[PDB]
């Protein structure tokens, strides 16, 4: 909408107060004009029609329980925009400052969140498996990263290419979580998953097997569920990324860690310069080796560590 840029204040899903960029024209809207062509947050009103209504508020204060998922969807989309711009010189998900749209209160008791090819969509959860999913910065950044993938490698969402697609989203979701630097970890979704259970998460990148996911290519799933295991076999790539960054010994193979920043540079270059819609795990290894070679040199520790990490998870 046309209006003047304003700054509201509210509370997110976890009860934390934050400022949000709004737009004033009769109402105060969740429309942040400070980033690209805008960040716009919508109310789906417990229905499944999308996007719903641009979020309107009478007083620029967002402290109601109903407001909390919208506050966090809007704010964390801003953090994710800032990460891609400041760290990777990428302007929004298309590289041309495309408007970022999100809808909250999708359906009733909906235990998921997703990028749909056009926008972000967040369920509220049923209060037992999930609380409103926009409360997790890694969740927001994971799903926005699918938009980056759509405009770059275009990894088809099935089998090995789909597991790479998922892992790329977990990797950058985690790197955005570290960028914001509030309780960062190598787990996925811990801030919104199972409010009654402490210390768990949806997936672990440091130890995928904690939640039944494979940490070695010899344990890959080859059935048809989950689009051929895209959220299962992602553990193999997530573990390799964790090893590249943090180092460790895994199935007797030692990896020299190179840190999160270099992990992000290597995988961002692989995603935007080398991966294709049909890339498999072996081709990801080659893309990561080439990306590290471009950035650090063929004789570098960075290249050696990429090879060690893929060796450790059984991907040649």
């Amino acid at each position: 909408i046309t209006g003047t840029s304003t700054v509201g204040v509210g509370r997110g899903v976890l009860g934390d107060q934050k400022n949000i960029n709004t737009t004033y024209s009769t109402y105060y809207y969740l429309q942040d004009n400070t980033r690209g062509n805008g960040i716009f947050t919508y109310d789906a009103k417990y229905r499944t029609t999308l996007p719903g209504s641009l979020w309107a508020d009478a007083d620029n204060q967002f402290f109601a329980s109903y407001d909390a998922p919208a506050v966090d969807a809007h704010y964390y989309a801003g953090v994710t925009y800032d990460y891609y711009k400041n760290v990777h010189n990428r302007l929004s998900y298309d590289g041309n400052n495309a408007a970022i749209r999100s809808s909250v209160h999708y359906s009733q008791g909906y235990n998921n969140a997703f990028w749909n090819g056009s926008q972000m969509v967040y369920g509220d959860g049923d209060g037992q498996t999930f609380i409103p999913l926009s409360g997790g910065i890694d969740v927001v950044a994971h799903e926005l990263t699918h938009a980056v993938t759509d405009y770059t490698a275009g990894l088809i969402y099935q089998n090995e290419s789909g597991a790479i697609n998922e892992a790329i989203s977990d990797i950058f979701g985690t790197l955005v979580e570290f960028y914001a630097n509030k309780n960062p970890d190598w787990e996925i979704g811990e801030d919104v998953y199972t409010p009654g259970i402490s210390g768990d998460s949806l997936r672990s990148m440091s130890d995928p097997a904690k939640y039944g996911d494979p940490d070695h290519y010899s344990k890959r799933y080859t059935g048809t569920q989950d689009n051929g295991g895209v959220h299962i076999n992602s553990g193999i790539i997530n573990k390799a990324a964790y090893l590249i960054s943090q180092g460790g010994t895994h199935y007797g193979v030692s990896v020299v860690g190179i840190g999160r920043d270099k992990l992000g540079k290597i995988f961002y270059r692989a995603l935007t310069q080398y991966l294709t819609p049909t890339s498999n795990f072996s081709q990801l290894r080659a893309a990561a080796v080439q990306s590290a070679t471009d950035l650090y040199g063929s004789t570098s520790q960075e290249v050696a560590s990429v090879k060690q990490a893929f060796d450790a998870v059984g991907v040649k």
Binding site: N111, W115, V139, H146, Q225, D226, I232
Partner: peptide
């Protein structure tokens, strides 16, 4: 369906 299957 995307954060989880």
């Amino acid at each position: 369906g995307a954060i989880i299957g």
